[PDB]
């Protein structure tokens with residue numbers, strides 16, 4: 062069983078680190094990005110689901126057969142569904158009734174059971190509250206509580222974090238900076254802890270959609286298209302008085318940016334375009350030659366009837382418009 | 396440039412090998428499968444596109460900027476689109492006008508240009524013939540000719556083949572057998588060459604849909620749902636008088652089988668369910684305890700409005716019905 066937990070680490074992590082070179086009005090810059098599609102269900106939330114349940118078993122927090130229950134329509138639902146099944150747990154996912162058939166289908170394909178929450182019945186906030194309710198009534202239940210559970214960010218401190226840190230040292234470079242958009246805060250907290258232990262002067266910045274500057278303002282919640290991040294509150298996991306300044310990207314700018322990365326061979330999700338632009342924002346402010354790291358949480362295959370496959374009206378302040386990708390200068394993997 | 400070609404090998408291969416244990420009426424059996432979603436565009440045809448173009452540059456068969464042109468709606472289109480862009484070539488894909496918006500979108504997302512071929516204008520056969528025509532008129536053109544190009548199967552002899560062979564020796568096991576469904580024949584020929592060099596008594600069997608026993612009959616072409624394999628002719632690449640007997644799986648049986656693998660945590664495409672069942676057919680005939688290897692070419696995310704997300708009428712001869720997946724007993728990766 063520690064044999065099982067040991068070998069299954071092999072279905073996650075160890076993803077490519079790419080050096081991307083581009084032209085930014087028009088001087089040549091570069092970003093380093095980890096590509097997280099190279100995982101069991103194609104996102105970074107595989108590293109997190111696996112770890113959450115490995116540690117959970119280690120501390121008797123979950124028993125064989127217990128129901129795993131969470132609120133998402135995104136990769137967390139997917140990651141937990143597939144590892145739940147691998148480890149033999151039932152999985153229940155709670156989500157807003159308005160999710161697309163596309164999403165529901167995927168989560169469902171892994172055995173997980175779908176309970177839709179009306180508008181009304183609380184909506185997204187509803188679904189979170191409905192998970193807690195289920196667990197009061199089924200005490201058996203294991204809740205990942207993805208927005209507050211420390212096991213999430215630890216996942217990234219021990220996993221993608223170590224990886225990032227080493228891949229960069231291996232090019233004899235320091236990390237001057239890291240940016241990641243925040244859904245749960247796990248990535249930016251976990252990786253950011255790890256980067257700071259090795260690169261004491263780096264800047265760890267959390268990313269928010271400029272359309273919904275929840276993190277930078279403390280209250281504002283608005284419609285945005287960057288899936289995976291910036292839900293309608295500040296997750297407990299994320300700790301702003303301990304991070305550097307917040308970066309903010311228009312969802313339009315991001316979409317476009319992800320359009321361009323695909324066009325140069327990297328099919329990614331909208332969040333990945335946001336990170337990229339964020340990473341350049343952070344570069345603009347630390348120095349044209351700083352090393353900036355970010356992540357590409359998933360690939361484009363799920364986003365195929367989203368604004369990602371449509372012309373975006375460009376706007377004056379977008380950075381995407383000034384950016385031209387030249388090449389992939391390097392790929393590491395270890 | 397041999398620096399570039401060298402580092403980009405890092406965006407493909409080195410995928411997990413899983414030992415799957417299951418119950419087959421009801422005695423316990425096992426299959427080993429390589430999981431090929433863990434690649435740049437999520438399929439096995441990444442290994443092949445990369446290799447085809449690496450060797451092509453090595454032999455001056457393609458020049459910077461030349462247009463890469465091929466006929467597919469599947470992973471080959473996708474793989475070639477994304478590596479073409481990475482390496483700066485234009486890509487044109489020819490496909491039947493009736494392809495779904497879903498497919499077109501994906502191929503397009505990577506920069507590749509879409510020419511649809513009527514029914515009429517030859518259909519699928521049309522599209523192949525239309526690629527040749529384009530290249531008569533644009534002599535510049537690089538054709539992958541995926542159904543006849545030896546560089547395809549070599550890809551798998553040097554790549555997934557080596558990997559398979561070593562991963563199995565590392566468990567102190569011989570390969571008694573391998574099965575792979577045949578679209579181009581690259582997988583089964585390339586891997587099969589490699590397996591035979593190390594496991595001289597293994598059986599290398601090509602897989603066909605029972606609904607369309609083109610390979611076993613020499614002529615029959617019929618409607619089937621297993622995407623990626625058994626188009627409407629026998630590809631030149633595949634060489635039947637040099638392989639073992641053909642296995643044949645109902646597309647319904649396959650679909651179901653892929654339903655079940657997802658439900659146990661492995662989201663796969665229909666072809667992957669076909670391979671699995673094939674692998675068991677081959678096991679039934681060599682001995683309940685033979686080691687059989689097969690491949691899971693891609694994941695389920697593309698197949699999301701296909702018969703994969705619908706109840707299949709079960710039938711007497713299906714093996715899926717008698718199969719119960721217990722667990723993933725092991726995962727290797729090196």
Ligand SMILES: *Cc1c(COP(=O)(O)O)cnc(C)c1O
Nearest residue numbers: 243244245246247248289332358
């Ligand atoms: C979860 C997610 C994010 C954000 O990661 P957190 O660690 O949850 O902040 C970004 N993009 C996508 C696609 C995600 O699923």
Ligand SMILES: *Cc1c(COP(=O)(O)O)cnc(C)c1O
Nearest residue numbers: 577578579580581582623666692
């Ligand atoms: C191409 C493909 C196959 C068959 O592989 P060949 O080497 O072309 O025979 C099987 N499944 C899928 C999804 C494929 O794209």
Ligand SMILES: [Cl-]
Nearest residue numbers: 264305306346
């Ligand atoms: Cl700062």
Ligand SMILES: [Cl-]
Nearest residue numbers: 598639640680
């Ligand atoms: Cl035989």
